[PDB]
Design a protein around this nucleic acid. Structure first.
Ligand code: MG
Ligand code: MG
Ligand code: MG
Ligand code: MG
Ligand code: MG
Ligand code: MG
Ligand code: MG
Ligand code: MG
Ligand code: MG
Ligand code: MG
Ligand code: MG
Ligand code: MG
Ligand code: MG
Ligand code: MG
Ligand code: MG
Ligand code: MG
Ligand code: MG
Ligand code: MG
Ligand code: MG
Ligand code: MG
Ligand code: MG
Ligand code: MG
Ligand code: MG
Ligand code: MG
Ligand code: MG
Ligand code: MG
Ligand code: MG
Ligand code: MG
Ligand code: MG
Ligand code: MG
Ligand code: MG
Ligand code: MG
Ligand code: MG
Ligand code: MG
Ligand code: MG
Ligand code: MG
Ligand code: MG
Ligand code: MG
Ligand code: MG
Ligand code: MG
Ligand code: MG
Ligand code: MG
Ligand code: MG
Ligand code: MG
Ligand code: MG
Ligand code: MG
Ligand code: MG
Ligand code: MG
Ligand code: MG
Ligand code: MG
Ligand code: MG
Ligand code: MG
Ligand code: MG
Ligand code: MG
Ligand code: MG
Ligand code: MG
Ligand code: MG
Ligand code: MG
Ligand code: MG
Ligand code: MG
Ligand code: MG
Ligand code: MG
Ligand code: MG
Ligand code: MG
Ligand code: MG
Ligand code: MG
Ligand code: MG
Ligand code: MG
Ligand code: MG
Ligand code: MG
Ligand code: MG
Ligand code: MG
Ligand code: MG
Ligand code: MG
Ligand code: MG
Ligand code: MG
Ligand code: MG
Ligand code: MG
Ligand code: MG
Ligand code: MG
Ligand code: MG
Ligand code: MG
Ligand code: MG
Ligand code: MG
Ligand code: MG
Ligand code: MG
Ligand code: MG
Ligand code: MG
Ligand code: MG
Ligand code: MG
Ligand code: MG
Ligand code: MG
Ligand code: MG
Ligand code: MG
Ligand code: MG
Ligand code: MG
Ligand code: MG
Ligand code: MG
Ligand code: ZN
Lengths: 122, 218, 37, 141
RNA sequence: CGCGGGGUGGAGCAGCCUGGUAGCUCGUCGGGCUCAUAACCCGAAGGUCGUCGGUUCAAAUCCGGCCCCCGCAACCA
RNA sequence: GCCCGGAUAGCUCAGGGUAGAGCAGGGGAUUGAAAAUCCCCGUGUCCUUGGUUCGAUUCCGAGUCCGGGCACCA
RNA sequence: CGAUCAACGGAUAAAAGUUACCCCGGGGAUAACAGGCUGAUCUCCCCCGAGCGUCCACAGCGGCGGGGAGGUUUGGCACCUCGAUGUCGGCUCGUCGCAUCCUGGGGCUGAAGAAGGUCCCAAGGGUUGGGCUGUUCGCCCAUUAAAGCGGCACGCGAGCUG
RNA sequence: CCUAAGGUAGCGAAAUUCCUUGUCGGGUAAGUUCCGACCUGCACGAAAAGCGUAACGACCGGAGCGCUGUCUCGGCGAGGG
């Protein structure tokens, strides 16, 4: 449940450590972004000599959220952070490792590359 | 003697002492089917290729082979695409270098706000250069940073401008609180602004952004 | 269609007719099709 | 465009626009003419636009007679200015044309050329007009 | 736009209250001094007075139009 | 667009009986050779196109443009 | 005989300013807001067809000139309101016009397709979130089918802000 | 040419800069505000003091962190009406 202003942890080795959401890429006036949605975001913190650097404007898919998502089996899942993986226009990760669990919803929404890179799909 | 105006139309020798600018030409052979020929020739005309030769390989009946000497630069983007499109695909092409040759070519300079932008100096054939200059002047108009003063954009074939565009002229609505009624109070603010734009026009060095170069040079 | 106040022959193959009060031009060249308005 | 070379007075009162034209009602120099059907102050810029239009039409051949002259100065207050403080400044000259007046005449030109040049020229003036052809009635005048 | 001032050799200024007369400094040009340049000395040219009109026997001058330049003003909303 | 004008040599320019000068050059004079100075010499398709004239840079058109006025122009 | 008593029927022989610290009597006889009348200016639409558009005046354009409409601009006028009709901008709540931003239907195209351009019909609904600035505007960022323009006392302070 | 004499140091788009959101640089995804600079100071300038200055300020700007019903966007609940 991400909206502009919200800070996300970046769960990949692109070099970004924190990004802030500047727009959720879903329709023309969507209020919120959940797991498997795409955001435009500003890189707020990065490690040196990374691939992305502070000030860059990037795309990213939400990979975990702190607000639980409700599943059609009747269950729900909740994570400790709101986190994202930086991706390109082809929805491909720009890094080569993803860190931490990710949500199973990423598979249907078309982020298979990210889903395999993950250490756990919940 | 001779040498080559290299990767810099700006870095010419002094067109004071000059007598021959040389294009690269090329021996260009076109295997069309039938009388797409009619289309083909119109294409090679505006590409300024001299028609040297044509020969029918008869049998049925279409097949014609056309030989052309054409400026090398006049292919390179555009041509192959248009060869293919006016001929529903059946036209072929091959070539080899075939040397150099004199061309009636002009140096077209591009100045923004009176200053010559070397980065945009090019070189064209006097049949076309106006239409070339009539184009860049206007695309540069749409991407230059609108200033506090109106910015002229110009193209000159050596010391004579041939194509002109103008950028605004961002201004302040100096009359915004003027519901008095007295025209003298609008004039007072209008005079001062007119005087200031003169001053900012005279000493106003505009720089072209690297984002504009990429926009004109696509 | 060309919708104008002054509709007129454009080429000699053009033909001028009256239609629903407005003056019309019809012609074998569709560019010349005009109704008044 | 025409204006008097010198004037006794710079500003003059508007006057009325009554009556048929006083003179200049018969074709006097050419073969065809354009005559006014309504009164008006025809401005110099208008006259110039009518002249040029017919000129353009006679690119090789033809004589154009301009038989109206803008001698009446036209006055206008500066914009956004209250009433008073004297009469406006001269901003142009007009010619007073009453109905029946011959304003332009063409000669040395085929009938078709003449009635087309005068038709365009009419389209440049603020008044309805009628194209006319030198008559025995002009000769008798 | 309103008020006031102004426009004169190439530059910067007198002259015009005041009609008849155009001056000062520098610059320019010809000559000298010096080996030479400047400084300096001698000699000369260059103004029809922004421009059109009027008044007058006569206009830089006086009066009006037009052009341009400078200063001041444009307030209560 | 508009009023005033203004497009004349590579450049900055003077101007109804085919137009020049500075300047850049190239060459030459001066010098031991240069700089400076000076001499000599061009292609002007008198901006482009059309017409006007016996004769057009000039005049009539049109086209593109340049410097000042108005006007659009947070 | 002393008058530029020239504010020239000539108030004293003798006279300038300032008030945002202000006060009273009056005036909608008279300005500023809004309304009205007008429509120069403004916006929009036409007429003419000179010139573009390799070719072709009218796919798209439209010199010089000409005719109108609107009543959103700046004004002109001074008609009700000065024993008071509270201002800009925002927020809130809208509703209306259509000269249509998107979406629906068309005609033309310099419309192969797709995507455009342009004009015709069309007002049912829709017409984002931010940075700057009091701002309305506008510029920028990120999007979007689109990020329309105007009227309603430049809608709306006995509804709020200030 | 004119003046009594022609504004020095320092400072400068400023509590001053009109034109003006001047230009350049910083900060922001985006900065008419802000900070640094430039100097074209309409109209800074030396006890109506000039340029600075540690500390101090319920003074007025600009930025970030923290934290929040200020807001997305409103819900519920309590008591006095
Ligand atoms: Mg945060
Ligand atoms: Mg992680
Ligand atoms: Mg940084
Ligand atoms: Mg008002
Ligand atoms: Mg027509
Ligand atoms: Mg038919
Ligand atoms: Mg009139
Ligand atoms: Mg009048
Ligand atoms: Mg009056
Ligand atoms: Mg008047
Ligand atoms: Mg008419
Ligand atoms: Mg002088
Ligand atoms: Mg005297
Ligand atoms: Mg001498
Ligand atoms: Mg010697
Ligand atoms: Mg005079
Ligand atoms: Mg006399
Ligand atoms: Mg005289
Ligand atoms: Mg005299
Ligand atoms: Mg005289
Ligand atoms: Mg006052
Ligand atoms: Mg006021
Ligand atoms: Mg703005
Ligand atoms: Mg008295
Ligand atoms: Mg009196
Ligand atoms: Mg009296
Ligand atoms: Mg009396
Ligand atoms: Mg007395
Ligand atoms: Mg008093
Ligand atoms: Mg006062
Ligand atoms: Mg006070
Ligand atoms: Mg008090
Ligand atoms: Mg006090
Ligand atoms: Mg009192
Ligand atoms: Mg009353
Ligand atoms: Mg009244
Ligand atoms: Mg009264
Ligand atoms: Mg009101
Ligand atoms: Mg009322
Ligand atoms: Mg109207
Ligand atoms: Mg009306
Ligand atoms: Mg209409
Ligand atoms: Mg054409
Ligand atoms: Mg056509
Ligand atoms: Mg109204
Ligand atoms: Mg009004
Ligand atoms: Mg009113
Ligand atoms: Mg009355
Ligand atoms: Mg009142
Ligand atoms: Mg009262
Ligand atoms: Mg009452
Ligand atoms: Mg706001
Ligand atoms: Mg509304
Ligand atoms: Mg409609
Ligand atoms: Mg439309
Ligand atoms: Mg539609
Ligand atoms: Mg296509
Ligand atoms: Mg299609
Ligand atoms: Mg479309
Ligand atoms: Mg269509
Ligand atoms: Mg609708
Ligand atoms: Mg709507
Ligand atoms: Mg703010
Ligand atoms: Mg769409
Ligand atoms: Mg917005
Ligand atoms: Mg209003
Ligand atoms: Mg209101
Ligand atoms: Mg209130
Ligand atoms: Mg309010
Ligand atoms: Mg009320
Ligand atoms: Mg306040
Ligand atoms: Mg308060
Ligand atoms: Mg001294
Ligand atoms: Mg000072
Ligand atoms: Mg100093
Ligand atoms: Mg400064
Ligand atoms: Mg600043
Ligand atoms: Mg100041
Ligand atoms: Mg700025
Ligand atoms: Mg910056
Ligand atoms: Mg940055
Ligand atoms: Mg930056
Ligand atoms: Mg930036
Ligand atoms: Mg800035
Ligand atoms: Mg600043
Ligand atoms: Mg600062
Ligand atoms: Mg001070
Ligand atoms: Mg002082
Ligand atoms: Mg002192
Ligand atoms: Mg002090
Ligand atoms: Mg200080
Ligand atoms: Mg110290
Ligand atoms: Mg301090
Ligand atoms: Mg304090
Ligand atoms: Mg901020
Ligand atoms: Mg709340
Ligand atoms: Mg409650
Ligand atoms: Mg309760
Ligand atoms: Zn037809």
């Amino acid at each position: 449940m991400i909206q502009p202003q919200t800070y996300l942890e970046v769960a990949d080795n692109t070099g970004a450590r924190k990004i802030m959401c500047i727009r959720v890429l879903k329709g023309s006036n969507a209020k919120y972004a959940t797991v498997g949605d795409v955001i435009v975001a500003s890189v707020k913190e990065a490690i040196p000599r990374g691939a992305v650097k502070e000030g860059d404007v990037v795309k990213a898919v939400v990979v975990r959220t702190k607000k639980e998502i409700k599943r059609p089996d009747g269950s729900a899942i909740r994570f400790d952070d709101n986190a994202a993986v930086i991706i390109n226009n082809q929805l491909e990760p720009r890094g080569t490792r993803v860190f931490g669990p990710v949500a199973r919803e990423l598979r249907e929404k078309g982020f298979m590359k990210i889903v395999s890179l993950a250490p756990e799909v919940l | 003697g001779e040498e080559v105006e290299v990767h810099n139309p700006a870095d010419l020798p002094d067109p004071t002492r000059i007598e021959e600018i040389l294009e690269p030409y090329v021996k260009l052979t076109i295997f069309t089917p039938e009388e797409y020929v009619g289309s083909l020739m119109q294409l090679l005309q505006e590409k300024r290729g001299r028609l040297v030769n044509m020969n029918y390989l008869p049998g049925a009946q279409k097949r014609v082979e056309l030989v052309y000497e054409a400026p090398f630069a006049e292919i390179l983007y555009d041509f192959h695409d248009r060869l293919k499109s006016v001929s529903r695909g059946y036209a072929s092409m091959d070539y080899e270098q075939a040397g150099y040759r004199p061309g009636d070519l002009v140096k077209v300079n591009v100045l923004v706000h009176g200053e010559v932008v070397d980065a945009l100096t090019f070189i064209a054939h006097r049949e076309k250069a106006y239409t070339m200059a009539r184009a860049i002047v206007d695309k540069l108009a749409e991407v230059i940073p609108r200033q506090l003063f109106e910015v002229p954009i110009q193209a000159a074939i050596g010391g004579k401008i041939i194509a002109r565009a103008t950028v605004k002229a961002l201004r302040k609505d100096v009359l915004a609180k003027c519901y008095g009624g007295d025209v003298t109070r609008k004039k007072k603010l209008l005079e001062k602004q007119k005087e200031g734009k003169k001053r900012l026009k005279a000493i106003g060095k505009v720089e072209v952004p690297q984002e504009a170069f990429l926009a004109v040079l696509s | 269609m060309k919708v104008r106040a002054s509709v007129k022959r454009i080429c000699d193959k053009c033909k001028v007719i009256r239609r629903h009060g407005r003056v019309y031009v019809i012609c074998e060249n569709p560019k010349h099709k005009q109704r008044q308005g | 465009m025409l204006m008097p070379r010198r004037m006794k007075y710079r500003k003059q009162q508007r006057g009325r626009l009554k009556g048929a034209t006083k003179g200049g009602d018969y074709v006097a120099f050419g073969d065809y003419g354009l005559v006014a059907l309504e009164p008006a102050w025809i401005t110099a810029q208008q006259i110039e636009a009518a002249r040029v239009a017919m000129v353009r039409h006679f690119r090789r051949g033809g004589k154009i007679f301009i038989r109206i002259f803008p001698d009446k100065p036209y006055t206008k207050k500066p914009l956004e200015v209250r009433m008073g403080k004297g009469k406006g400044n001269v901003e142009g000259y007009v010619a007073v044309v009453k109905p029946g007046r011959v304003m332009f005449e063409v000669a040395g030109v085929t009938e078709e050329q003449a009635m087309e040049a005068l038709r365009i020229a009419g389209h440049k003036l603020p008044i309805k007009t009628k194209i006319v052809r030198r008559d025995a009635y002009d000769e008798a005048q």
